Amino acid sequence: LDKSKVINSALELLNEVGIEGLTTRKLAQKLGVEQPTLYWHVKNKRALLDAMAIEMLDRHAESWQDFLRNNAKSMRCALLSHRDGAKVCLGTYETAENSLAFLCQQGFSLEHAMYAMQAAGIYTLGCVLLDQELQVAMPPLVRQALELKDHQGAEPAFLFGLELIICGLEKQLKC
């Protein structure tokens, strides 16, 4: 039993039971150890999720604009990888640092560069958080909304929101 072996069953197990379902006992059970053994690889449910989150991102995660774009898209992908995958991400260094330079090398007031990182990430995050709950969960205007909304999903909505964000980043830069 290495730590890899734990984190990955954790992810399978996630798929089966959901984030509320995912207990250290249930994990111990699947892996066929006893609960205590697990603590050699994980502090507790918190530290474990934080580990699961990372792995998701490892696995499923040039101009500046088309950095932001490709960063999010991958994040977004990474989140939808698993049940309740966004909820996991919610509650959780070098890659950070690079980014904020690679941003400031294109004339970005660090502060702003942060807020750019943040805006995209938070949005990507909200979108998926929401694709994932509608899972768990008329007048005439609405219905086509809905039916076009259904025909398509959220990927358009995702991208179209990703797009305004970038647009406004061009504008708040020229200043």
Q: What are the residues binding a second copy (CB under 8 A)?
A: 90-94, 96-97, 100-101, 110-112, 114-115, 118-119, 122-123, 125-127, 129-130, 133, 136-139, 141-142, 144-145, 148-149, 156-157, 160-161, 163-169, 171-172
Nearby residues of 161 by Cβ (< 8 Å), 6 or more positions away: 123, 127
Q: Which long-range contacts (CB under 8 A, 24 or more apart) does 143-146 make?
A: none
Find tokens 């730590």 and name the residue: 3
Nearest residue (CB) to a second copy, 31 versus 50: 50
Nearest residue (CB) to a second copy, 34 versus 163: 163
- Report the C-alpha gap between 127 and 106 in whole angstroms: 28
Nearest residue (CB) to a second copy, 1 versus 145: 145
Smallest separation (angstroms) from a second copy to the CB of 51:
15
Smallest separation (angstroms) from a second copy to the CB of 133:
5
Q: Which of 15, 85, 20, 13 is nearest to 55 (CA)?
A: 85
Compute how many other C-beta atoms are within 10 angstroms of the C-beta atom of residue 51.
19
Nearest residue (CB) to a second copy, 1 versus 146: 146
